[model samples]
Target: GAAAPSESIPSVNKAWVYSEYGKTSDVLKFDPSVAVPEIKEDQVLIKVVAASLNPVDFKRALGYFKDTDSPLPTIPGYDVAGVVVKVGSQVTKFKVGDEVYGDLNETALVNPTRFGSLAEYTAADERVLAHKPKNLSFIEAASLPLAIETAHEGLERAELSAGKSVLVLGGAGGVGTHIIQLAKHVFGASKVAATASTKKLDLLRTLGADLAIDYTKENFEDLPEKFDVVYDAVGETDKAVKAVKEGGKVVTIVGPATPPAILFVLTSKGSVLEKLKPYLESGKVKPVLDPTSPYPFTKVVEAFGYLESSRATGKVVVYPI
Candidate 1:
C-alpha cells in the first residue's frame, strides 16, 4: 500500500496500437512488440490489472477532439487499475508494491507519456493515481477513475455539497450514476433528483436520486420545484438552466453551455480520489457497472464497440489483463 509494489517488469508490452485516425475496427491493431513503457524520476510504471474504456477511446480514434488531437501511434486508454511495479527515483509515495487506480495519461497534448493503460504496462505521473480501495475489485475500482472523478469534479464546479438540492439531467447515465451517489452520500445533498427514461426511474432512485423524472413524459424544466444546482450531464444545457433557482449554478460536462455555466474538462488528480476513498470503502459512492462489463483484454475491441453503441447503462470495463 506504500510506494509502487515490488513487481517484476518485462521487456515487451502488449497493446492496441493505431497509427492513423479513423474508426476503431479500421485503425486499431493489437501489437505484441511494443516496448514496455519507461518511467521518469517523477513517474511510476504500472502493471495493468484492469482498464476501463470511455467515449474518449473511440472518439480519439476518430480524431474527435474538436481539433485537439491524440498523439500519433496512440494507445488509447485512460482509466487504469494496477499494481505498482517499478518506481522512478523520486517516487517515494508509492514504493515497489501498491494497488492503485486512476484516470492517468493526461497532459498528452502538452507533455506526453510513453503509453496509455490499453497495454500490459504503462508509466504515469505519481500524482495522477491513488491507492485502490481495499473493498473494491480491480474491475470495480477501474470503473471509478474516470466516471467518479468526472462526477465529483462537475459537482465541485457547481460548489455542491451536503444540504443542497441538485437535479442531474441524465440520472441513469455513466456520469449521472455517480453524480447522484456523490451528491447524496459524499456531499450530503438534501435532495438528489435526476432525469431518466421511465424504465430507469427505479434505477435512479436506487442510485440515491430522491426524484427520478421521466424525461420522456415530463420536462424537468417545467417541474414545479427548482434546485440549487442543475447538473447537465447529458447535454441539455438550455433545459438544465431553466431548472435552477435564481442565482443558482448549472454545471455541465456536455457542450453548448449558456451564461453562468461551469463548463470545463476534467483534470484527473489523486487528491480527489483520496477524498473519495472513504466513500468508496463505505459503499456510499459505489460504482454502477454495466451488465456487459468485465471484458477480457482479448475482447477489448468488442468492448469498445459496445461502449460506442451508447447502450451501456453504467461503466463498461476490461479486466484480467
Candidate 2:
C-alpha cells in the first residue's frame, strides 16, 4: 500500500523531537510543528526510507554537543537512506526518484531544522550522498553512513597499506567491524587484530579479523607484539598510540589524542556515500543490523532509550512511517 502523505507536505513533516537536553527517554517525541528543512543550491530532498542510529545520537540528545548551542526541541539523527523526491536547482548529480543515502551535514554545530532521519523526509548535500546499491534493501543501506565513514576515515588517515599489521580496539562494535573488513579488502592489510567480547569473537573472525582477542578475559595491551598501525574505534586515543610500534601510526575516531609519535584524529569528513556504494554494489561489504524499530516519530523516544543502553552490537535503524 502507498504510504499516506504527511499533512500538507509542508516545508517539513513529523519528527522525533526533543525540547531539552536530557536522557532520550525524557526528551524525544513525535511532533508535527517541526519545520521541513530547505535545500541549499547543491542539496537534494530525500523521502527517507530508513534511518540509522549511532552512539552520537544519544550523546547529542544528552547534550554532548551542548557546549556548542545545538538548541532545544531539536531532531537528533545523522545517517539516512531514501529516494530523492526533489533536488535543488544547482544539483546535477541526481534527479527525483533516485535512490540515495548520506550523513547529514552538522559539522559547524548548526543544528539542522530537520536533523533526525527518524522522519519521512530530509534534505542533504549532494556531495555527501550517492546512489544506493540496487542489491541492498533500504534497511541494509541505512547501516553504512556513520560506522563505515568512521572506519574509512580512520584507515585513510593512517594511510594503511597492503601487508601491514593493524590493530583495532573495540573491533566487535559497528565501526570496528567495518574497519576490520575495509582494512583487509581495501588496503590489503596482512594482519588484523581486534578486541571484542567473547560473544563477538566468531563474528569478528567472519568479518576477516585475523585475530580476535576476548577483551573480557585478556588485555590486548599486554600482547608481546606491536602493530604497524593501531585504530581505536573504542574512543581510546591514548591507548591506541601506545599499542603501535615505533614509527607506526594510530588513528582514533573519538577525538584527538597526544601520541608518542604519529597520531591522527579521524573526524567525520569524507565521501563515504560515494566510496561505500561500489562496495555495496559489488557485494563486498554488508550491513550488521543491531536492531530495528518502527517509525512513527513518536517511537524516537523508545529508540533513543534503546540506544542509550550501550549494548547495541551494530547499526540500529528506524524504518520510516
Candidate 3:
C-alpha cells in the first residue's frame, strides 16, 4: 500500500532545530512548522522515509562545526533514505519515485543545505546519492552512508586489500561496525580485531571480527600482535598508530594524532558514493540498523534525545513526516 500523506503537513513537518550550540537537550527542538525547501539544479527532493543519526549530528547542533563558519539554526543530520519525489533538470540518473539514500549536506555546521533528513523532505546533490539497494528497507539503507562512506574513504586512503590484518578501534559504533563488515566482505582482509565495550562483544563477533577486546577490561596495545592496517572507527588515532606495525597504515574519523596516523576527515567532497554503489548493489556490503523512530516532524527532539545516550547498537533512524 502507498504510504499515507502527513495529516498535518504544515503543522507537523517535524525537524530538529537548534538555535545555539550545546548539549542535544539544550539545543534541539521539535519544530513542526519547518517547511520543506525548494529544489535546485542537479538536486533531488527526497521524501525522507528514514534517516540515521550520527554523533556528528549532535556535535554540529552544539556548534562543533559552527566555529568554522558553519551555518546555524541548522538541521543536524547527514544519512537519509527516501523516495525521490522531484529532481532538478540537470539530474539524469534518478527519476520520480526512485528509492535512494545518501549523506545530504545540511550546512557546513550540519552541512551546507538549509534542510536535512530530520524533516519530511530534503534536497541532495545527484553526485552524493545512489539508488537504494532493493534488498534493504529504508531504515537499513539509511544506516550506511556516513559509516560506510567513511570506512570506504579510509580504506581507499590506506590502499586496503585482501589478506591484510586490520585493527578497528571503537569497532562497535556505526562507522566501526561497517568498517568491520567492509574489511571482511569487500577488502577480504584475513583478520580483523575490534576494541569495544564488553556489551558489544557478541555483536562484534556477529559482524565478523576475528577478535574482540573489551577496551575497559583489556589493554588493546598489549595484544603483542601488530596489524598491517589499523582503522580507528572511534577516532582514537593514538591507539591506532601504536597498534599498527611499522610502515603500517592507521585511519581515523576522530581527533588526536599518533605518529604515522592517517586521518579520515569527513567531507562533502569525493565520489565515494559512486564507488560504493556497486558493492551495495551486489550485496557485498550492508548496513547495520540499530532501530527506527516514528515520523511526524515533531519527533525529532525525541530522536536526538535517544542518540544522546550514545549507546545505539548500530544506527538510529527517523521516519518521514
Worst 10 contiguous positions by lDDT, candidate 2: 261-270
Tens digits of per-residue lDDT, candidate 3, 173-213, equal 78888888888888999998898898899989888898999
Per-residue accuracy of model 2 over 100-131 as CA lDDT, tens digit each = 87777535244543455776778788877878
What digit string (tens of lDDT, one per residue) describes model 1 on residues 142-217?
8887788888988988989779999998887678899999999888899999988878899999989888899889
Top candidate when judged by TM-score against the true structure: 1
Off by over 4 Å in 1: 1-8, 66-70, 107-114
- Candidate 3 residue runs with Cα over 4 Å from true position: 1-12, 106-111, 268-274, 277-284, 291-298
Error of 2 at 58 (Å): 1.6
**What is the descending TM-score order?**
1, 2, 3
| Alpha-carbon RMSD, candidate 1 | 2.3
Cα shift from native, residue 161, model 1 (Å): 2.5
Q: Could you tell me the TM-score of candidate 1?
A: 0.94
Model 3 residue 135 lDDT score: 78
For model 3, give the RMSD to the true fold. 3.7
